[PDB]
Amino acid sequence: SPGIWQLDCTHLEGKVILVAVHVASGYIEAEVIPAETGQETAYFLLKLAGRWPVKTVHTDNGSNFTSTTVKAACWWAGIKQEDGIPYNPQSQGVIESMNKELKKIIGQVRDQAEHLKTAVQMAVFIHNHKRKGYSAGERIVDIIATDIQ
């Protein structure tokens, strides 16, 4: 469970926001992309896995699960590619709630930012620092550190 991530794709301003959630902590990384292609998803996973110890990724949909390019990136980066079927039904609600929260924060910034990508990274910052009391950023580091030891 320290190495389990879930992909999530949401839309805003006619643009695509690709999100990776560290399931145990709620910590996220995100990027704005023109469209969710296998290539874009593969590149995003490469970046993620160079930065955190990504053991398993639950893909956000069947197209990214099927994608040879995504499979190739998972092979390259040593990631077990899995489906994202909500066997525990609460998983749908959790992801939906996060997308709502993220969009709310995006709305709260951007009087401040010209470009959506800046607003999305501001939202990532606020989400990961928010105390709920530890933050998601604190939880992910503690979870992974405990695993190392």
Ligand X SMILES: Cc1cc(CO)nn1-c1ccccc1CN
Q: Enumerate binding residues for its own copies (CB under 8 A).
A: 29, 43, 46-47, 49-53, 76-77, 112, 117-118, 121-122, 124-125, 128-129, 137-138, 141-142, 144-146, 148-149
Tell me if 61 contacts ligand X by CB under 6 A: no
Contacted by 25, from its own copies, ligand X, none: CB < 5 to 8 Å by type:
none
Using CB under 6 A as the binding rule, whether residue 73 contacts ligand X is answered as yes
Residue 149 is encoded by which pair of tokens? 């030891």
List the one residue out of 128, 125, 110, 99 whose CA is nearest residue 17: 99
Question: Does residue 129 touch ligand X according to CB under 6 A?
Answer: no
Give the pairing type, strands 15-22 and 28-33.
antiparallel
Say whether residue 112 binds ligand X (CB under 6 A): yes
Rounded to the nearest whole angstrom, what is the least distance from the CB of residue 28 to its own copies in the complex?
9
* Measured distance CA(2)–CA(126) in Å, rounded: 22
Angle formed by the axes of helices 116-129 and 136-148, nearest 10°: 60
CB of 18 to its own copies, least distance (A): 14
Radius of gyration of the chain (CA): 15
3-state secondary structure 91-122: HHHHHHHHHHHHHHHHHHCCCCCCCHHHHHHH
Retrieve residue 42's tokens: 């593969």
**Contacted entry of ligand X, its own copies, none for residue 85, CB cut-off 5 to 8 Å set by kind:** none
Q: With binding defined as CB under 6 A, does residue 30 bind ligand X? A: no
Q: Which residues bind ligand X (CB under 6 A)?
A: 39, 42-43, 46, 69, 72-73, 76-77, 112-113, 118
